[PDB]
């Protein structure tokens, strides 16, 4: 969370930096699920 929490600092207080959020959103997705269900 706190890796992707602190990226809106790097777009709104104004490329590969956009891949810091999307290819980590697949792990933001993979955060909550393996907490509940790790199939």
């Amino acid at each position: 969370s706190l890796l992707i929490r602190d990226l809106n600092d790097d777009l709104s207080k104004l490329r590969v930096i956009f891949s810091r959020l999307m290819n980590a959103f697949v792990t933001i997705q993979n955060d909550v699920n393996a907490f509940i269900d790790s199939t």
Binding site: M22, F25, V26, I28, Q29, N30, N33, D37, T39
Partner: protein, 57 residues
Amino acid sequence: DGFTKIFETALNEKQITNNRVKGFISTYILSTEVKNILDTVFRKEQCVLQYVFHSRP
């Protein structure tokens, strides 16, 4: 995909013969795209759903 990021597939040319004609009237689908869609269809069409997710009056 199985509980991780339902996403999008494209259309053939027979779909987009029905967007060019209605003018007078693969990607991801990320987790911040399905939030606006359920804003409507759970409060627009509440009246079918007020009891079908209920087992009581």
